[PDB]
Amino acid sequence: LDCTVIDGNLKQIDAGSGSVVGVNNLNETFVLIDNVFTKISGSLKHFSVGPAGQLGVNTANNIFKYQSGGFVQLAGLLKQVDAGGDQIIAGVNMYDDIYCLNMDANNKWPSSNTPWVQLNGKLKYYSCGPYSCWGVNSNDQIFIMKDVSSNVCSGSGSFINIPGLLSMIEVATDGSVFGVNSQGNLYQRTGVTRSKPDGTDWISMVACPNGHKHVSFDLGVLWLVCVDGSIRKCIL
Amino acid sequence: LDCTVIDGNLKQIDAGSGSVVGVNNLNETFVLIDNVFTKISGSLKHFSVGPAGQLGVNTANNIFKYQSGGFVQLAGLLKQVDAGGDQIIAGVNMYDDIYCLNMDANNKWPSSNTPWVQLNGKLKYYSCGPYSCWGVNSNDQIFIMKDVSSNVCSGSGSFINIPGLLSMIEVATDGSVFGVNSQGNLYQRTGVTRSKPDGTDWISMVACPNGHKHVSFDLGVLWLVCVDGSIRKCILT
Ligand SMILES: *[C@@H]1O[C@H](CO)[C@@H](O[C@@H]2O[C@H](CO)[C@@H](O)[C@H](O)[C@H]2NC(C)=O)[C@H](O)[C@H]1NC(C)=O
Ligand SMILES: *[C@@H]1O[C@H](CO)[C@@H](O[C@@H]2O[C@H](CO)[C@@H](O)[C@H](O)[C@H]2NC(C)=O)[C@H](O)[C@H]1NC(C)=O
Ligand SMILES: [Ca+2]
Ligand SMILES: [Ca+2]
């Protein structure tokens, strides 16, 4: 791929809703402002942005949402969280248990309860898009939850295995699906539509010179963290 | 309303998706970062943030969306634009024509076209929330469009008049509705729910000792631009 380098060093990156955010190995938190990854207050090991807001988790697995000028702590524990769904929150905890929060609950603040929904299965990484969520388990097996909607965040309730192996996976607001495998190779799912949410094939792509670490996609731009923590921007 | 004053001066403010943005009298563009309004690049006369993204318009009525590190120009002309709907964009042009953009179009990039849908009618201000949009016309009359959805952004197609007079109006991600009238009074719509999207009445409240100019609400915090451009950050009681 034809990609440009952009200054910075990260371990994780997420793009969504026109925003791009990430964290470095020190767990410092960054937002892309006028083409500069800009440090903001916060300690997070994973930071996500999309239609559901700006959501992250820290080393203690506490959950944070940027609101009204700064991070506020939500109730619950997750090791990874994603905000790419249709105003829903999704993620996994330290036991690979899988949770989502429906739109109406996400948008209620202050709240007297945080009504997490547990999904049936085990995943180590989980990401949502417009009509589905995708994740991978501890054996790098890939799964899709179909029929996900804003107030039925758990979708059909039954995960479907998609052949292949990936270590992480992200779903974009246009429905695009990208992931990186344990060997540091980068893949895109082809043939993904609302009518065929599972898509058809995995295609190989190269953005990094010596291996890929993390990937996210938004609005025609593929974002990579390479193995050395450096960043690539690939306008597709 | 229990308020603090946040340093700065704005003419317009919008809050949504946990973000707070706005523009000043000079059309400098701001985002609230770590409790400080921070200038970003851009000349905009209205800047909105919500589940549909970060959308603004400039003095020439060109439309801009923040994506991938900076503003990109979309097709079309609007004098006001809102991103509070469910991944839909809505707004009005200089002739008070009313438009919306469906979710699937909003999320498509590259796009050699921005396929705006025109709603029948005239409004000078239009704002969207989770299941409806509200607007006001040039005579300050108030309207709701119900059962707006991500890929039917035009909703029922039948604007319903809600008695009262307002100069602008905003709809929050939790469905809350607030507005400011021509005299600088501030109102909330009471009784708004999914079962009753039109609500029941208007209630007056004051955040600005010197009168109100603009309002937006998100996640339990009401944001005011006062008549003098000062900024109040409030919680409800
Ligand atoms: C940044 O966050 C990571 C992930 O939480 C921290 O690394 C973990 O630290 C805990 C102890 O606090 C250990 O139980 C884990 O084994 C560590 N995981 C990994 C992958 O290293 C890391 O220490 C944090 N760094 C800073 C500077 O805050
Ligand atoms: C900021 O934008 C406003 C709104 O476009 C500008 O005020 C308008 O200026 C135009 C000329 O470009 C006039 O035709 C309008 O009558 C003005 N409208 C209002 C409401 O005053 C304003 O000049 C801009 N300021 C800067 C520094 O860019
Ligand atoms: Ca994501
Ligand atoms: Ca708004």
From Swiss-Prot, chain A:
Its main location: secreted. One of its GO terms (molecular function) is carbohydrate binding. Glycans are attached at N27. It is found in: Secreted. Keywords: Disulfide bond, Glycoprotein, Lectin, Repeat, Secreted. Disulfide bonds join C3-C234, C100-C153, C128-C133, C208-C226. It holds the Pfam family Tectonin. Residues 1-199 are annotated as: 5 X approximate tandem repeats. Sequence repeats lie at residues 1-34, 35-68, 69-106, 107-156, 157-199. Expressed in the eggs. It comes from the Eukaryota. GO terms for cellular component: extracellular region. InterPro entries: Beta-propeller_rpt_TECPR, Tectonin_beta-propeller. Belongs to the tectonin family. Lipopolysaccharide-binding protein with a very low agglutinating activity for human A-type erythrocytes and interacts with both Gram-positive and Gram-negative bacteria. This is Fish-egg lectin. The lineage of its organism: Eukaryota, Metazoa, Chordata, Craniata, Vertebrata.
